[PDB]
Design a protein around this nucleic acid. Structure first.
Ligand SMILES: [Zn+2]
Lengths: 82, 206, 129, 24, 101, 82, 132
RNA sequence: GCGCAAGACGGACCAGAGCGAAAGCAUUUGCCAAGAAUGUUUUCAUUAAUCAAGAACGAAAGUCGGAGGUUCGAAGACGAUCAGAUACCGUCGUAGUUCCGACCAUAAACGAUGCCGACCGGCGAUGCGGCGGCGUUAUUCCCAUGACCCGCCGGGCAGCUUCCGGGAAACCAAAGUCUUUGGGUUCCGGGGGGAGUAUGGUUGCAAAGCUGAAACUUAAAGGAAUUGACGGAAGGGCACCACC
RNA sequence: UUAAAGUUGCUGCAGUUAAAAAGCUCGUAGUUGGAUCU
């Protein structure tokens, strides 16, 4: 060390740090776009959702809250938004 | 190598490094040796970057060549695995060898028998040759050492990343340094391969 | 809690240069910190630096040139009249040939010699040599 | 031992409470 | 002056540790300060095994053992030569004695 | 170091560390001064010239004299880019 | 007890390191070569040196000793040292290389090596000693 | 040996492990309210740090009434030992030890180290929460979920190492960033005794707690470390002026 | 009586072991208080 470049840390260095301790703060969460296996509507869900998210009319549970990221039910797929 | 195309490392040399197991380190990593490694592989062994090894070896060769008196350079090995390779390095370049136990007070006590005042010091192991390397901090000595992934870098000015544990690796690493020193001085041609083979430097279990 | 953020700024720079480092991170940034750093830099003690925006109190990366012996803050900001400056510089500066006391006056943040040229007193922010 | 001397100085005070009163 | 960094104990991050009685004195010692030994012995010694199997009605009978946990105060571990004194530097060696060899 | 008449009134001018820019004193016996040889671009033999670096005992006690010399040699073109 | 002393041991070591050619295994001949050369006082001290010489020459046949240095032994050990097999140990038709080392060689523009053979790495990540 | 009852107590698992503001906390199950850490692209928007007065809790012992009293056991009665023993050892045994309700506010209550905040070296572990990754196992499968394995992040109890620096040193990654002396704030010390005593005030049923001098006396008392001498401290060696 | 006394310490002392951090926490007065506007 003793000559570490504090201005330009590598992407592998910054992704390993705590979110508040990075050079600029950034969340580790995202919005993911979930599809019910039976229903056709496509629903946006927070990665760390605290509420049991369910379809408005198709009456199907999409996820269950846990201590970290919410857990999707079996048969439901997703993909990160942008 | 200052990005020169004549000082670049060749396939016949990388094949020698691979056969001797020079690229393979230990399970532990020193925090000041981290920039010299490539990656850690499963079974927990660190891989040393041979490009970095070549650059450091050429820098050490340059430092040795800058010494006008060939005998002012002293080469030291405590472990037997390096005792045939420092008596053979010193017979080709003219340096002064110390194989075996280093007597405390060689560089500081001015009335002893084997009192010497080197201008440069090259050691085989920072952890094993610790007394010659700390005694050099009393008399203004630069130090070149062959370093593993777990080697401390105190009083070490040129650290060469290598496997300093295997006999083939130690002999090859001492044979390459002598080859580069002679080819930098200009006593050996750079096109014809050296007629001396690395086997002369190796350690043999009786 | 964190009071006198400039004290933390100046203690971080002093502690890093004892270790022989080439760069230091200062958080949070502040305009008093920036003006003090500029005063230090125009005298050749630190060198170029850079402010990072966070949509918050930003941070600063400072390059170090190994020319700094000490930089410190004085708390509280005592009022200094132009007739009491000689005693302060006797107490704080290591010699009469080098060293600076940094004050804030109504004409700006400056050192003890520009203040004498401009004939003004102020409040003492700190010192560096 | 200071513990015993502390105990000794307390019995003296307890007895002086009786031998030195407001009624005296 | 202070002799041991751990005050002769194992107490860290707690206030009170329940006491126990020394096996030899019946003296109250904190559980983290007492000297503890687990003894797994044989009921019959090697001086009696040859006279025990010849009278045993079961072929290949394995004789039982005896399991006792012993607690000592600092004074009995020293008197009974369970624990010795040692030099200032050796005091920092907390590896069990090489009995398992 | 010099008076108003411009005369130099310093007994000698000490050396400074190439790494930390610290003055190397007269009783700093752990300081080194190292020459690294320079070669020809074509034949690659010892030109006859060298570059000199001074490292102080505090820096080389810290374990950072190996990276310091490597950085100084990279800056002067002796060591290849990466 | 019959233990020699530093005087006799030093003198015998010096005699052996200086006159290796004439000394041998026989005691009664080494007893007569010591009197010819070294200025030694009486027979009792002469014999204790010439006996340890005879004892110490047998050890030389077994190999070198850490107390003396003969240049003829130096020559013999240099003949032993100047040994190289016809086929070195570092020229191999096939060199076994891990998949992780192969990528490092790829970064070293050595992806055209023909002596290499990538092998399967160990799967169980169990390289630590159990604790306790 | 088979039963019955009484009160006390939760062994072994139990650790340089966990929780609590500190005293302190260990059998199962259920109810009641509370809490840290982690997760968060939720919300308010300076709401904060330390604190005279004033308050809550505070081991053990001790004091008042009720209940119960297994064990242990101040006092006391004996038996031994001893020159003497009002002690250490032994046999009994009162108050107490336990519970309910009020007092008492003290400990080597100790990390002998106030609290809040920033910076300054490495390494391996451990407890909790989260994140990622080959592969074993819950028997042969679906996924989650558990038990292992390899890492990363945050907050904890600690450990090893270091010419970070400090210190009288022992030693301390804080006891560092101190003549290169200023981040905020509370309490408290000024050679050794007299003496935490007298006196006044105040609280308490009492025992006592808190606050707290002076006259006089004295050249040292004291802290770390070093060579010896000695030990009814532990290990080794030698001698027919020691033994066998 | 002043300096010496950085042995009254605002400048400028000490509180692990030499004299010394309240058993612990709450809490009013007092003291101190994060970016941010040419
Ligand atoms: Zn006991």
């Amino acid at each position: 060390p003793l000559a570490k470049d504090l201005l330009h840390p590598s992407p592998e260095e910054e992704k390993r740090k705590h979110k508040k301790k990075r050079l600029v703060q950034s969340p580790n969460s995202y919005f993911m776009d979930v599809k019910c296996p039976g229903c056709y509507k496509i629903t946006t869900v927070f990665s760390h959702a605290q509420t049991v998210v369910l379809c408005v009319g198709c009456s199907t549970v999409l996820c269950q809250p846990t201590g970290g990221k919410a857990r999707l039910t079996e048969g439901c797929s997703f993909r990160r938004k942008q | 190598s200052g990005a020169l195309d004549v000082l670049q490392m060749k396939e016949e040399d990388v094949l020698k490094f691979l056969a001797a197991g020079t690229h393979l380190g230990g399970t532990n990593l020193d925090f000041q040796m981290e920039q010299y490694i490539y990656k850690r592989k499963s079974d927990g062994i660190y891989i040393i970057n041979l490009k970095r090894t070549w650059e450091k070896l050429l820098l050490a060769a340059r430092a040795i060549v800058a010494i006008e008196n060939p005998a002012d350079v002293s080469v030291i090995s405590s472990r037997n695995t390096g005792q045939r390779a420092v008596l053979k390095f010193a017979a080709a370049t003219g340096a002064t060898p110390i194989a075996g136990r280093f007597t405390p007070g060689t560089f500081t006590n001015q009335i002893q028998a084997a009192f010497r005042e080197p201008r440069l010091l090259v050691v085989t192991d920072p952890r094993a040759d610790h007394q010659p390397l700390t005694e050099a901090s009393y008399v203004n000595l630069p130090t070149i050492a062959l370093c593993n992934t777990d080697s401390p870098l105190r009083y070490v000015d040129i650290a060469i990343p290598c496997n300093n544990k295997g006999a083939h690796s130690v002999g090859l690493m001492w044979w390459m340094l002598a080859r580069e020193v002679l080819r930098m001085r200009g006593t050996i041609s750079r096109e014809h391969p050296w007629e001396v083979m690395p086997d002369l430097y190796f350690y043999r279990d009786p | 809690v964190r009071m006198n953020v400039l004290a933390d700024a100046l203690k971080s720079i002093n502690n890093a240069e004892k270790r022989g480092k080439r760069q230091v991170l200062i958080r949070p940034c502040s305009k008093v910190i920036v003006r003090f750093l500029t005063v230090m830099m125009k005298h050749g003690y630190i060198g170029e630096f850079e402010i990072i925006d966070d949509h918050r109190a930003g941070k600063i990366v400072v390059n170090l040139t190994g020319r700094l012996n000490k930089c410190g803050v004085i708390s509280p900001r005592f009022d200094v009249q132009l007739k009491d400056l000689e005693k302060w510089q006797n107490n704080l500066l290591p010699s009469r040939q080098f060293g600076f006391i940094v004050l804030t006056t109504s004409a700006g943040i400056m050192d003890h010699e520009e203040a004498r040229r401009k004939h003004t007193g102020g409040k003492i922010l700190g010192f560096f040599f | 031992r200071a513990k015993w001397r502390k105990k000794r100085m307390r019995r003296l005070k307890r007895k002086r409470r009786k031998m030195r009163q407001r009624s005296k | 002056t202070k002799k041991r960094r751990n005050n002769g104990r194992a107490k860290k991050g707690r206030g009170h540790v329940q006491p126990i009685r020394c096996t030899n004195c019946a003296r109250c010692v904190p559980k983290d300060k007492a000297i503890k030994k687990f003894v797994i012995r044989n009921i019959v010694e090697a001086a009696a095994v040859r006279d025990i199997s010849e009278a045993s009605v079961f072929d290949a009978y394995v004789l039982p053992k005896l399991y006792v946990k012993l607690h000592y105060c600092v004074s009995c571990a020293i008197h009974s030569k369970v624990v010795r004194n040692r030099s200032r530097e050796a005091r920092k060696d907390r590896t069990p004695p090489p009995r398992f060899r | 170091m010099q008076n108003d008449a411009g005369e130099f009134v310093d007994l000698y001018v000490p050396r400074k560390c190439s790494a930390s820019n610290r003055i190397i004193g007269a009783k700093d016996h752990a300081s080194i001064q190292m020459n690294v040889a320079e070669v020809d671009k074509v034949t690659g033999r010892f030109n006859g010239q060298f570059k000199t670096y001074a490292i102080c005992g505090a820096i080389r006690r810290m374990g950072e004299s190996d990276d310091s010399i490597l950085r100084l040699a990279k800056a002067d073109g002796i060591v290849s880019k990466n | 007890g019959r233990v020699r002393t530093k005087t006799v041991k030093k003198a015998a070591r010096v005699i052996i390191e200086k006159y290796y050619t004439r000394l041998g295994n026989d005691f009664h001949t080494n007893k007569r070569v010591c009197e010819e050369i070294a200025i030694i006082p009486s027979k009792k001290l002469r014999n204790k040196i010439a006996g340890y010489v005879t004892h110490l020459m047998k050890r030389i046949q077994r190999g070198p000793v850490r107390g003396i240095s003969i240049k003829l032994q130096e020559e013999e050990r240099e003949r032993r040292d100047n040994y190289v097999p016809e086929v070195s140990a570092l020229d191999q038709e096939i060199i076994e290389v891990d998949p992780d080392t192969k990528e490092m060689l790829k970064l070293l523009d050595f992806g055209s090596l023909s002596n290499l053979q990538v092998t399967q790495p160990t799967v169980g990540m169990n390289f630590k000693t159990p604790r306790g």
